[PDB]
Amino acid sequence: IANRFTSNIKGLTQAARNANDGISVAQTTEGALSEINNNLQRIRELTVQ
Amino acid sequence: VGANDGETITIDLKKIDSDTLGLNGFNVNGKGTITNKAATVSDLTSAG
Amino acid sequence: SAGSATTNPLAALDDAISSIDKFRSSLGAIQNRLDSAVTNLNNTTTNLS
Secondary structure: OHHHHHHHHHHHHHHHHHHHHHHHHHHHHHHHHHHHHHHHHHHHHHHHO | OOOOOOOOOOOOOOOOOOHHHOOOOOOOOOOOOOOOOOOOHHHHHHOO | OOOOOOOOHHHHHHHHHHHHHHHHHHHHHHHHHHHHHHHHHHHHHHHHO
């Protein structure tokens, strides 16, 4: 049972690290998207003009 | 995200560019609707 | 011949760990019974002497 618990603990720690990496991916993509949105807003203002 | 097989979370990505948003020939400096000239006998016979 | 990625890696690793644990448990049980045999032999030797 101690061996099983050790396996579970190590797996869960590594899984937490993987989830942190996923959060990083999402943050980067969302920053790029925000820049794209600003560009689109400026384009719409130009078209209105 | 888990310690066993199958414990996965999926992030869906979308191809964002001009093509998937339209805007390709976003030709705002164009001419728009233009009234065409009336036909005449010369091009009437030119048509055959 | 070349192969491909294993379909279910964690299950195979769990099976290997379980086999190792079963072997260790059997070995420990045998060693405990051997120690008990040693104690009984010492007592019998003393009494017969």
